[PDB]
Amino acid sequence: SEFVKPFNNDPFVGNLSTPVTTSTATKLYLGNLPIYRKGLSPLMRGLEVGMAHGYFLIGPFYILGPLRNSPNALLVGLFSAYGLIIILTLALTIYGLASFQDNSTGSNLESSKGWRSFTSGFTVGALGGASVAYVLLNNVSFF
Amino acid sequence: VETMEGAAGPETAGKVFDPLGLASLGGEETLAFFRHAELKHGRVAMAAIVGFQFHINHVHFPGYLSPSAGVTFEQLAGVGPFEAWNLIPLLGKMQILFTIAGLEHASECLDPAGHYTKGGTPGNLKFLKKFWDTPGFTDKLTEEQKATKRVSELKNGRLAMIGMASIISAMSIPGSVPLLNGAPALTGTGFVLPFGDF
Amino acid sequence: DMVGACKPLGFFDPLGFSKDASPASMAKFREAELKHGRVAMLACAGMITADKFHPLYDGKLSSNPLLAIAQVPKLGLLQILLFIGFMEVFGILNSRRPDYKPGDFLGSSQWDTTEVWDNYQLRELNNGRLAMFASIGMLTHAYITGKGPLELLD
Amino acid sequence: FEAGMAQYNADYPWLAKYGFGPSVKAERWNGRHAMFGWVAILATGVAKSHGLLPAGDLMLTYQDWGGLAQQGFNTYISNERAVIMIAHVHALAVSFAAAFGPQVLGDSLTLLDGEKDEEPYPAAEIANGRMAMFGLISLVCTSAFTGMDILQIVDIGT
Amino acid sequence: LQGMVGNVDFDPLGLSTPENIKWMREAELKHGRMAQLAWAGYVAVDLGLRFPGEKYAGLTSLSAHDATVGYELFLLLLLVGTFETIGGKQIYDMQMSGANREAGDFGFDPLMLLKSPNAEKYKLAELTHGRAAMIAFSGVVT
Amino acid sequence: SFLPSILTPLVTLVFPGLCFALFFVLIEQDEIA
Ligand code: CLA
Ligand code: CLA
Ligand code: CLA
Ligand code: CLA
Ligand SMILES: CC(=O)O[C@H]1CC(C)(C)C(=C=C/C(C)=C/C=C/C(C)=C/C=C/C=C(C)/C=C/C=C(\C)C(=O)C[C@@]23O[C@]2(C)C[C@@H](O)CC3(C)C)[C@](C)(O)C1
Ligand SMILES: CC(=O)O[C@H]1CC(C)(C)C(=C=C/C(C)=C/C=C/C(C)=C/C=C/C=C(C)/C=C/C=C(\C)C(=O)C[C@@]23O[C@]2(C)C[C@@H](O)CC3(C)C)[C@](C)(O)C1
Numbered sequence: 025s026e027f028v029k030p031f032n033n034d035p036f037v038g039n040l041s042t043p044v045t046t047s048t049a050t051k052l053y054l055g056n057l058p059i060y061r062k063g064l065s066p067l068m069r070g071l072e073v074g075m076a077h078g079y080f081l082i083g084p085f086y087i088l089g090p091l092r093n094s095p096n097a098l099l100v101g102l103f104s105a106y107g108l109i110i111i112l113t114l115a116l117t118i119y120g121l122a123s124f125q126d127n128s129t130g131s132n133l134e135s136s137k138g139w140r141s142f143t144s145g146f147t148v149g150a151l152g153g154a155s156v157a158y159v160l161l162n163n164v165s166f167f
Numbered sequence: 168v169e170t171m172e173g174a175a176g177p178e179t180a181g182k183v184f185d186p187l188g189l190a191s192l193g194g195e196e197t198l199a200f201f202r203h204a205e206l207k208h209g210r211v212a213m214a215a216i217v218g219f220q221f222h223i224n225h226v227h228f229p230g231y232l233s234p235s236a237g238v239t240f241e242q243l244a245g246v247g248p249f250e251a252w253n254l255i256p257l258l259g260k261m262q263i264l265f266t267i268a269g270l271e272h273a274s275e276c277l278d279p280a281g282h283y284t285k286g287g288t289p290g291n292l293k294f295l296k297k298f299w300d301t302p303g304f305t306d307k308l309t310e311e312q313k314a315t316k317r318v319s320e321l322k323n324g325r326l327a328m329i330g331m332a333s334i335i336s337a338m339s340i341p342g343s344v345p346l347l348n349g350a351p352a353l354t355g356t357g358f359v360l361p362f363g364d365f
Numbered sequence: 366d367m368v369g370a371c372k373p374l375g376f377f378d379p380l381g382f383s384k385d386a387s388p389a390s391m392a393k394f395r396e397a398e399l400k401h402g403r404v405a406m407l408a409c410a411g412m413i414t415a416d417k418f419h420p421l422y423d424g425k426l427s428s429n430p431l432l433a434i435a436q437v438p439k440l441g442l443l444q445i446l447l448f449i450g451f452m453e454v455f456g457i458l459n460s461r462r463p464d465y466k467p468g469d470f471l472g473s474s475q476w477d478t479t480e481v482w483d484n485y486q487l488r489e490l491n492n493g494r495l496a497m498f499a500s501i502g503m504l505t506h507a508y509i510t511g512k513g514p515l516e517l518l519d
Numbered sequence: 520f521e522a523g524m525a526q527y528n529a530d531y532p533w534l535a536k537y538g539f540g541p542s543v544k545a546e547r548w549n550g551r552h553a554m555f556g557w558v559a560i561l562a563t564g565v566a567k568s569h570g571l572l573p574a575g576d577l578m579l580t581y582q583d584w585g586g587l588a589q590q591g592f593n594t595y596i597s598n599e600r601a602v603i604m605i606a607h608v609h610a611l612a613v614s615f616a617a618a619f620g621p622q623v624l625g626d627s628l629t630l631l632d633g634e635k636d637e638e639p640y641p642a643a644e645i646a647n648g649r650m651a652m653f654g655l656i657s658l659v660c661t662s663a664f665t666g667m668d669i670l671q672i673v674d675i676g677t
Numbered sequence: 678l679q680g681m682v683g684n685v686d687f688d689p690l691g692l693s694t695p696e697n698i699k700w701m702r703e704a705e706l707k708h709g710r711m712a713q714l715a716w717a718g719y720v721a722v723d724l725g726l727r728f729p730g731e732k733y734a735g736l737t738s739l740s741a742h743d744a745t746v747g748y749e750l751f752l753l754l755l756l757v758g759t760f761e762t763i764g765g766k767q768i769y770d771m772q773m774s775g776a777n778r779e780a781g782d783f784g785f786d787p788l789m790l791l792k793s794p795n796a797e798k799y800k801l802a803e804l805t806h807g808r809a810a811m812i813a814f815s816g817v818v819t
Numbered sequence: 820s821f822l823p824s825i826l827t828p829l830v831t832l833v834f835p836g837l838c839f840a841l842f843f844v845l846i847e848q849d850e851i852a
């Protein structure tokens with residue numbers, strides 16, 4: 025009872041159709057993640073990715089930062105998250121500039137306009153997510 | 168509101184009886200929703216009348232409601248109709264609310280034809296099989312008897328809402344209803360909060 | 366048809382159900398059966414291990430299953446509920462898929478399966494049935510005596 | 520001066536396309552920031568008059584801000600410096616969101632990218648920006664040469 | 678800009694342009710609805726309609742915010758943030774991307790009251806009631 | 820003075836980062852048509 029078969033019935037492609045690669049759970053989770061979800065605009069993809077990453081980026085800096093044992097621990101963590109997000113979106117912009125040099129299609133992550141929209145969504149979402157995480161950690165007594 | 172069953176009645180002069188004209192707030196969908204709300208209110212008011220009678224009379228299950236917390240049906244049956252609900256343990260109240268929640272969700276979802284506003288019959292719950300008429304007592308009858316029986320359901324439901332609103336005010340507005348003022352039984356709060364304090 | 370039939374009882378179905386029910390109803394029944402079996406196996410393993418080995422929460426949570434969950438903080442319960450809800454929306458999407466195979470998040474209709482696959486599926490099903498009975502027994506014993514499974518066995 | 524623009528462009532042919540350089544978009548944006556900065560230094564002047572800014576000889580400590588406090592160094596950072604720096608950090612964060620984020624509303628920064636042009640020069644805001652930036656360079660010139668500070672010069676001149 | 682719900686040529690110091698008119702009308706409707714709820718809440722809290730509780734009994738509308746910031750207003754902030762995140766998905770996609778949708782239409786019509794013969798009436802009533810509440814609240818809060 | 824605080828991060832983090840970004844983009848620029 026074989027469970028590892030050729031990828032898309034192609035023995036000569038460098039891949040295997042394992043349970044990890046091809047199972048229904050993997051397909052569902054991957055295809056429903058924002059980067060692969062159907063119908064989402066590049067702005068919406070970038071926005072979702074941005075809030076998801078900016079929400080959790082604050083935590084390492086807040087807990088394990090140099091000023092963890094200081095009254096300004098959370099503020100310093102938020103500023104660190106903002107700086108890291110600035111670096112991340114600068115990386116995104118230069119990546120778009122290097123990769124999608126000539127393009128006129130748009131509405132596609134592999135085009136200049138689409139990648140710019142994705143980066144804009146990522147920046148706004150990450151800033152908002154870091155701010156929301158700051159608010160939650162300030163009001164941690166609620167939970 | 169002219170095809171609905173409650174349209175014709177001897178007491179309403181055979182009129183639809185919509186003074187405020189609320190049937191025209193929307194299409195047939197909002198009127199179907201209003202009829203479903205009326206039927207659910209009448210049904211809950213019927214059950215409330217029966218439970219209120221069973222409570223103001225001495226009729227309770229024998230034993231301990233919550234052996235862990237020492238709350239007993241006897242304690243509930245001697246604090247008036249409504250403070251009994253407060254006396255129920257919070258987690259038991261949550262298990263009543265959750266069961267009613269799941270039943271309501273099933274009512275909204277599982278109709279094969281569709282929503283009561285969008286194809287289903289308002290008040291129809293028998294797609295949850297044997298939820299109604301578990302005994303199946305109504306299987307003998309035909310549609311023509313069921314028509315008059317649903318008309319009587321609507322009328323008795325309206326009367327039951329009237330009665331429960333009576334008892335719920337007489338608690339709150341003193342002597343709200345003449346003849347429902349003595350209160351040999353009607354004591355305490357008139358309207359309880361859900362989950363006691365939240 | 367399906368895989369549940371086994372030697373001790375054969376095709377156990379005294380009360381109909383299987384016949385006069387839609388294929389969707391049969392798929393729903395098997396999905397519910399597998400979900401019950403899997404959750405019951407998890408519950409049995411959790412109770413058995415947590416009776417005598419509970420290092421989390423500074424080892425202060427009681428061995429009683431029906432009171433340990435009461436003592437667990439609210440945030441932990443919320444996170445467990447969120448995880449289970451995520452698994453269940455994945456199950457709902459799998460149901461919406463056009464090639465659903467009740468309970469099969471692995472796919473398994475896209476591989477050259479043989480009778481050994483059916484035998485292993487039956488092994489899962491029977492272990493799930495045994496756990497379904499056992500977990501309810503464990504919970505009832507915990508409610509009655511106040512002791513957990515292994516503490517009761519002591 | 521257009522000849523100098525062509526000489527630049529020519530030399531730096533890349534920075535040119537995004538509007539970075541001697542471009543009307545760049546001149547407009549600075550001018551906006553220079554007008555806001557005249558407003559800003561006036562706001563700090565009246566805030567310091569009304570003792571708005573937590574201020575004095577109070578200084579930060581290593582236990583509150585760590586190595587950025589610079590406690591033990593010759594530099595003596597004040598709480599007024601800290602709070603004004605926090606305000607500027609908020610300004611920078613909002614600006615960064617407006618720039619790298621959606622062109623939600625208003626005006627772009629990088630020449631609207633998309634191969635747009637620079638519209639050579641109400642539309643008098645560029646003249647005001649000329650005014651504001653020449654005032655600012657004059658203020659630094661006096662602060663460097665006459666050595667008469669900045670807030671003091673603003674107060675005595677006004 | 679010449680045809681809209683309750684539309685007249687009331688644009689002194691004008692700002693509304695074909696690009697931003699939909700965003701501006703969304704902002705108008707959102708502010709209006711928040712104003713009706715704020716006016717209703719303030720007038721109720723002043724009149725005497727109050728939650729059952731000792732924490733609420735001693736509070737007034739001016740002092741309620743500081744007392745309720747810890748738990749109650751924080752829960753309200755969480756819920757409002759969730760709903761506004763969904764609304765912000767729709768609005769960001771509409772303005773800064775591609776979308777065919779009107780202003781203020783979040784799909785919150787489950788009762789199908791917009792199927793009535795008079796639905797433009799409801800839209801206009803929402804607009805003027807929002808405006809009237811947004812000005813009454815300006816009076817009472819200040 | 821305050822010049823160390825103003826200049827050391829400016830010249831050791833912002834300027835080298837921008838230089839790395841510019842160099843990366845420039846080396847990744849493709850041939851003109
Ligand atoms: C090559 C010589 C040289 C070197 C190695 C340094 C080194 C230093 N300077 Mg700098 N500095 C220099 C010349 C130099 N300086 C000159 C001539 C001036 C102008 C008066 C300054 C003015 C100055 C100030 C005001 C400050 C420093 C500071 C510093 C320190 C931090 C770095 C910084 O951001 O400062 C760089 C700041 C500048 C103004 C640099 C100006 C431009 C120089 C001359 C460029 C040298 C380029 C070199 C010849 C070629 C590079 C080749 C390439 C392949 C790498 C560091 C020890 C800071 C300090 O004291 O921290 C404790 C500080 O506050 N320097
Ligand atoms: C790799 C080993 C290592 C580790 C574990 C640490 C750890 C730490 N260092 Mg660092 N450090 C290291 C190497 C390391 N250091 C080295 C080599 C140097 C010399 C240059 C330094 C120099 C240094 C300094 C100078 C300082 C620190 C500090 C710190 C602390 C905070 C740093 C911070 O903000 O991180 C931020 C980290 C992140 C934003 C992200 C980390 C990665 C995440 C958590 C990974 C998650 C992966 C996930 C599971 C993937 C799958 C997910 C999927 C299933 C959904 C922390 C205790 C600071 C401190 O205060 O120390 C007490 C400090 O001042 N370090
Ligand atoms: C609730 C869990 C559950 C569910 C959903 C199913 C579902 C199924 N089983 Mg069953 N099964 C279960 C538990 C369950 N089983 C357990 C624990 C055992 C061990 C005794 C078995 C043993 C078993 C065998 C040996 C076989 C099946 C088969 C089947 C299939 C056909 C019968 C049917 O339609 O049943 C419908 C079932 C329900 C609607 C569940 C509710 C039933 C009643 C209304 C209430 C519960 C009964 C009773 C009161 C128990 C609780 C009391 C006490 C023990 C606490 C179907 C997929 C056959 C199959 O797969 O053939 C291809 C088959 O051969 N099952
Ligand atoms: C593990 C993977 C993963 C992760 C990490 C996420 C993460 C997220 N998903 Mg999900 N998603 C996933 C898988 C995942 N998803 C899958 C597989 C599916 C398929 C079912 C989806 C489908 C999906 C959808 C359809 C949507 C999401 C959305 C979201 C986001 C929820 C935001 C929200 O409204 O929170 C709740 C809100 C809050 C917690 C905020 C609370 C309020 C705070 C406390 C106040 C802040 C105040 C502050 C000062 C600001 C003031 C503003 C103003 C007054 C000026 C979040 C980033 C939503 C989204 O918006 O994405 C774009 C969304 O619509 N996801
Ligand atoms: C489609 C649809 O609608 O489907 C469904 C959905 C819906 C609505 C949900 C339905 C339902 C009803 C269902 C299935 C309800 C299930 C309810 C369930 C399962 C309720 C468990 C309670 C357990 C408790 C309270 C335990 C207490 C336990 C206590 C008090 C203890 O701590 C025990 C203990 O203290 C002792 C005694 C002694 C001490 O030494 C030790 C400790 C402290 C440990 C319907 C009607 O079927 C329809
Ligand atoms: C001066 C004056 O009067 O002042 C006061 C005093 C006064 C009068 C007390 C007041 C009051 C209260 C009032 C009027 C209260 C009224 C309450 C009312 C009217 C309560 C109905 C309950 C019906 C139920 C529960 C039915 C269940 C029915 C069921 C479940 C079945 O029989 C099932 C069934 O399968 C059988 C078994 C046989 C089948 O053939 C038929 C079907 C399928 C259906 C007022 C208004 O305050 C005024």
Ligand SMILES: CC1=C(C#C/C(C)=C/C=C/C(C)=C/C=C/C=C(C)/C=C/C=C(C)/C=C/[C@@]23O[C@]2(C)C[C@@H](O)CC3(C)C)C(C)(C)C[C@H](O)C1
Pocket residue numbers: 520523549550552553555556557559560652653655656
């Ligand atoms: C001589 C000559 C030439 C020439 C020339 C001439 C006359 C050139 C003159 C150039 C001139 C006069 C250039 C000034 C720029 C000033 C700027 C950008 C200032 C911005 C400053 C800003 C935006 C500051 C903002 C703030 O800080 C403020 C104020 C307050 C703080 O809260 C923080 C903020 C950020 C808000 C040719 C023609 C070129 C050819 C050849 O070369 C020969």
Ligand SMILES: CC1=C(/C=C/C(C)=C/C=C/C(C)=C/C=C/C=C(C)/C=C/C=C(C)/C=C/C2=C(C)CCCC2(C)C)C(C)(C)CCC1
Pocket residue numbers: 075076077079080148149151152153155156758762
């Ligand atoms: C799958 C899985 C997993 C994982 C998980 C994860 C990965 C998670 C994550 C999570 C997360 C990570 C989350 C997040 C969240 C977020 C949020 C919730 C956010 C929000 C935000 C907001 C709301 C914002 C807002 C805003 C904006 C947008 C902009 C402007 C500003 C503001 C603020 C307004 C595990 C391992 C467990 C295992 C099992 C499976």
